[model samples]
Target chain A: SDLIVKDNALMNASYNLALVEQRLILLAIIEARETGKGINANDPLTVHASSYINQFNVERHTAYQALKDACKDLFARQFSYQEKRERGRINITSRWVSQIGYMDDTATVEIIFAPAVVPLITRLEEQFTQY
Target chain B: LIVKDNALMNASYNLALVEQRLILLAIIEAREINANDPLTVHASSYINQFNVERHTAYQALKDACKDLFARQFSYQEKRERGRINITSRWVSQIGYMDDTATVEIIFAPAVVPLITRLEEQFTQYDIEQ
Candidate 1:
């Protein structure tokens, strides 16, 4: 039942990643564990090019290039969400990755999430699909 | 950027990677080539692009088209309270014809909320298509 609504009317919020980059984001998270990235909270994640190949059937170079750009957008983008409660509301700015880099020699893009992000994605959970 | 996993939820939940791409390609064709247009998707495209067997190519389309028409989707938006539920389907109608084994699907308006951002970096380059 969880879904993301990018309603620009009510809020000035915008998801900064480009659409292709967003696709990389999904694979990246799924791959953080697979690509030899540590599982502990706050550990850096390196989403290799192979994952994209398996998912999208794209070339190694193409997928790697997309990952390089996606990590750039992931690190550069920031979001501010305002929560409204019965009694009050709060405004919070969130960062997706603590640091990011594209390894030219290895063809792998690396990302480290802020510890705060680990809480949201780490726990075992399941729900619906569409993007 | 916040890559909300929830964003990609869709009616084609059970499709294989290739089929998902094929169906998405069809959706893109419907949007960019002609608006609300009935579009055809060839199994040959998948074969040439992915180096898959010719048989696997058309079969993928056949399976996806059937599952597409038979499936129902519940669209949801994350709200301050929680979520707003909207029951919907991906295509208004679906047809899989002979020959190239192309599938014809007129996308449902309900899909607008999901695919409306229609153009972006990915749109700039035809991804293996």
Candidate 2:
């Protein structure tokens, strides 16, 4: 591929997710989605916080507090992208989510994936990782 | 459950900030050298990598470099030779690119891991590049 406009929002987010606390938010979302439903990246995504706390063995009190913080930060976080297949040089400002929700008693957090970042989380016929 | 690999045995998270993170990344992308060599990048390119206001672009970059130099970081990986440690502060110098408004930086040898050794060690760039 020829050189193109480049950004590192996704790279940065990917790097950040490797952290224990942040990855939980993603893992929680992954766990909450229906078996065959990742079609609408524009729609809000909801995650079960209790499961994250249970599975990750984080203290319920502390985990919930941190989980909320993750949601808030996720809204502000963005990924940089470079698309050169069709365009000569493109620098895509890939935002993570449009909106986030935290269900206190229900223990679920809602997230809306940015349209630009839809392909990454929605479909995975070939290059994909879900854990 | 909890994270197994703590980055560089240090725990400052603001390096996770986008603008700050982008600055470090810009330096990495600007790089063109082998291990243990001085690394530098084009100031114009770095300025365009993000959307910082042009009026303060130079100062923005300068501060990012200074912030980067003041921090520490780490991550762990399994290497063919054993556990290859990924750790470093990543820069030692920042200056004008040919006396123009553009800038340049010299990365520390410690950053060699993120540049080279990270290949096959979980950093996709190390393997893909």
Candidate 3:
């Protein structure tokens, strides 16, 4: 398992994810780690069905179908949070993945986290690791 | 404000703008609040947060506290077998302190996680929108 740090406010942010959707996100985070470049809001990360199966011990077919289903709903998914800026605090309503798709040949799903979310994940990695 | 989609979707209640604003203030401070103690919202702070005039903010917040205490909301829960509809108040107890111009509210037990637990199944939104 890869080390993924989650900030307190983000952990409590308002949103929902299906079990398979959660698995897909986990895989994407790991993929970002393996790349050694870390995750950014813009870069598209791939989560392969093969990787999902290897990690979760699911049938290849099941993993593929689940990833496909997750891809469909991932775009509509939204989360809410209050962001602190130098000017003042502001509330943000945003989606989980800005874009997501299943590649036919590769059996992979590529996702880009919403721009507002990128900092939350990166901050978790920095602050938690320091102390 | 942050909230679970289902919690908002399943909720059966209507609150005016001021009432909603008060609830949000309490929610943001949820980490410091619990069943045993009440969360206090001062009129000055409310004015600062929402940019309301001092006199209007004080009057509105005090009025909101009175109604909010008796305000009940219902939401559904799905068990393995069936759906359950539960009705509850927004606050277990609420009061307005005249001297300090503050509202003190203790959130109902059911409303706690929807605001406090953001582990997943939640979304954030701008109240202005």
Each candidate's B-chain TM-score, in sequence, is: 0.63, 0.52, 0.72
* TM-score quality measure for candidate 2: 0.40
> Could you say which candidate leads in lDDT?
3
Query: What is each candidate's DockQ, to 2 decimals?
Result: 0.01, 0.02, 0.02
What DockQ would candidate 3 receive versus the native complex? 0.02
Worst 10 residues of 3 chain A by lDDT: A1-10
Off by over 4 Å in 2: A1-9, A17-21, A33-36, A84-88, A122-131, B1-129
Candidate 3 residue runs with Cα over 4 Å from true position? A1-9, A13-15, A85-87, A122-131, B1-129
Model 3 local distance difference test score: 0.58
Q: For model 1, how does the per-residue alpha-carbon lDDT over A1-131 read when each residue is reduced to its tens digit? A: 11132122112322344655655656666786565665432344656687778877776667777777776665554444443322344232334454455555556665555333444443211111123
**Each model's Cα RMSD:** 20.6, 17.5, 15.0
lDDT of 1 by residue, B1-129 (tens): 212224335334454555466556675555553213455666666566565677667777777765654444443444343433333334444555554366555544444455534333233434655
Best by TM-score: 3
Model 1, stretches more than 4 Å misplaced? Answer: A1-16, A35-41, A82-90, A122-131, B1-129
Sliding window of 10 residues with minimal summed lDDT for model 1 chain A: A1-10
Considering chain A alone, report the TM-score of candidate 3 relative to the true chain A: 0.75
> Model 2 over residues B2-55: C-alpha lDDT tens digits?
122344223434553432433455446654342222233444655565555667
